[PDB]
C-alpha cells in the first residue's frame, strides 16, 4: 500500500536490492538501513554518468544515446576514468588522440 | 533545468487564491505530502510560492507538468473565459487520437506544445500553445479544446492569437475520423448552457 522507494525519495528499487543482498550470500544477516543507502549510491553514479553523457549527445546534435557517447563521457572525465579503468565498453571505439 | 518554467509555475500559483491552493496542489499530484506538511500555509503569498518553487527546484520539473498544472487551473476558472462550440461530421480509442493529433500538429508547424488530461464522461482537455517556425511557443496565451469521444462536439476557448483557427480545425478534423467542421452561433461564458443546448438535441435526436 506504500512503496519503499517513495519513503526513500529515490528512483532505484529497494526491495530488489535487499532480495539480491540476501540471496547472494554476502553475509548471514542484513541490516535494514543498508540497501536504501546502497541504492542511493547507485542512483547517484548512474545520474552522474548519464548527466555527462547527455551533454555529449546534444553536442553531436542527437537525442538518442549510442554507446559512443558513453565511451566519450567515461574517457573525458577524470574521476570516472579512475573508476572505470579496466573496462572495454562494447561498440565503443577510442578517443580522438593524435601524437 | 531551464530558468523559464519556474517563472511560469510561480505566476500560475500566484494567480491561485489561498481558498483552494491546497486543493490544487493535492489534485496536481507532483510533490510529496511531507513537503506539503513542511510549507507554512499561514504567511503571505509572496513567499509560499518561493518555498514551493524551491521544493520544485530540487526534485523534478518540465514544461509538461507546468502545462498540466495550467490545465487544472483552467478547469476551475470557467467563469473567466468565453467559449466556442464546434462539431464534426462526415464519418474508438483515444490513444490513437492523441498520437494522430500530436503528430499532425507537429508536422503542420515547427514549434507547438500539446498537453492532454483525462476527465470523466470520456472527456479530454487539450491545451495548445501555438508558435512559429522561429520562436518559442507562447505559454501565456493558450488555446483549450474540450473534446468528447462519443459526441462529435468540441468546446473551443478563444484567444488573442487568431489565424491558427482553420489550421487547428482542419488538423483536428483530419486527426479525428471526420471530413467536415462547422462553426455555430454558440459563443457564451458558461459551459453548462452550451452542454445543455448540445445534449438536449443530441440525446434526443
Amino acid at each position: 500500500a506504500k512503496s519503499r522507494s517513495s519513503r526513500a525519495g529515490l528512483q532505484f528499487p529497494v526491495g530488489r536490492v535487499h532480495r539480491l543482498l540476501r540471496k547472494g550470500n554476502y553475509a548471514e544477516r542484513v541490516g535494514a538501513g543498508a540497501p536504501v543507502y546502497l541504492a542511493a549510491v547507485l542512483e547517484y553514479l548512474t545520474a552522474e554518468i548519464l548527466e555527462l553523457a547527455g551533454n555529449a549527445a546534444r553536442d553531436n546534435k542527437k537525442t538518442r544515446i549510442i554507446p559512443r557517447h558513453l565511451q566519450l563521457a567515461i574517457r573525458n572525465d577524470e574521476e570516472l576514468n579512475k573508476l572505470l579503468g579496466r573496462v572495454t565498453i562494447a561498440q565503443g571505439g577510442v578517443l580522438p588522440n593524435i601524437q | 533545468m531551464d530558468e523559464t518554467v519556474a517563472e511560469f509555475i510561480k505566476r500560475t500559483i500566484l494567480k491561485i487564491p489561498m481558498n483552494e491552493l491546497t486543493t490544487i496542489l493535492k489534485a496536481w499530484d507532483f510533490l510529496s505530502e511531507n513537503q506539503l506538511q513542511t510549507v507554512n500555509f499561514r504567511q503571505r503569498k509572496e513567499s509560499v510560492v518561493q518555498h514551493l518553487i524551491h521544493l520544485c527546484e530540487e526534485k523534478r520539473a518540465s514544461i509538461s507538468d507546468a502545462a498540466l498544472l495550467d490545465i487544472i487551473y483552467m478547469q476551475f476558472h470557467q467563469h473567466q473565459k468565453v467559449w466556442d462550440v464546434f462539431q464534426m461530421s462526415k464519418g474508438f480509442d483515444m490513444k490513437q487520437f492523441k498520437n494522430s493529433f500530436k503528430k499532425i500538429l507537429q508536422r503542420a508547424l515547427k514549434n507547438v506544445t500539446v498537453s492532454f488530461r483525462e476527465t470523466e464522461e470520456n472527456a479530454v482537455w487539450i491545451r495548445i500553445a501555438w508558435g512559429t517556425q522561429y520562436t518559442k511557443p507562447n505559454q501565456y496565451k493558450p488555446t483549450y479544446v474540450v473534446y468528447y469521444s462519443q459526441t462529435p462536439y468540441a468546446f473551443t476557448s478563444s484567444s488573442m492569437l487568431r489565424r491558427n483557427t482553420p489550421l487547428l480545425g482542419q488538423a483536428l478534423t483530419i486527426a479525428s475520423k471526420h471530413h467536415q467542421i462547422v462553426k455555430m452561433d454558440l459563443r457564451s461564458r458558461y459551459l453548462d448552457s452550451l452542454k445543455a443546448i448540445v445534449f438536449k438535441q443530441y440525446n434526443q435526436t
Binding site: 529515490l10 528512483q11 553475509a27 544477516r29 541490516g31 538501513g33 549510491v41 547527455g54 537525442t63 | -
Partner: protein
C-alpha cells in the same frame, strides 16, 4: 521472468533530461554497469563483515565500502547523498 534494470535507468534519464531517448543496446550497457558496481560494493563490504568478526551489514559498512571503491570527489558526493537519503528514510 528474467528481470533487469532498464525501467529504473529510463526513469532516472527522464528525470534529469526532458526527452533524451536511449537505444535498446546502450541500455544493456547500463545493466552490465549496475549489476557490476553492486557486485563490488556489496561484495567488498561483506569482506569488512569478516575482518572485524561480525555477521551484519549495516549502513556504516556500506559507507566505508563507498569510501574505498570510489575516487575522491565522487566518493565525497556519494557519501553526502546517501546519508541524506537515510535520514529522510528513518523519520518515515
Amino acid at each position: 521472468r528474467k528481470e533487469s534494470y532498464s525501467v529504473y535507468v529510463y526513469k532516472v534519464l527522464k528525470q534529469v533530461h526532458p526527452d533524451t531517448g536511449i537505444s535498446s543496446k546502450a541500455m544493456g550497457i547500463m545493466n552490465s554497469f549496475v549489476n557490476d558496481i553492486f557486485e563490488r560494493i556489496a561484495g567488498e563490504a561483506s569482506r569488512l563483515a569478516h575482518y572485524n568478526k561480525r555477521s551484519t551489514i549495516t549502513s556504516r559498512e556500506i559507507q566505508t565500502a563507498v569510501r574505498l571503491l570510489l575516487p575522491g570527489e565522487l566518493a565525497k558526493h556519494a557519501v553526502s547523498e546517501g546519508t541524506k537519503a537515510v535520514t529522510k528514510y528513518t523519520s518515515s
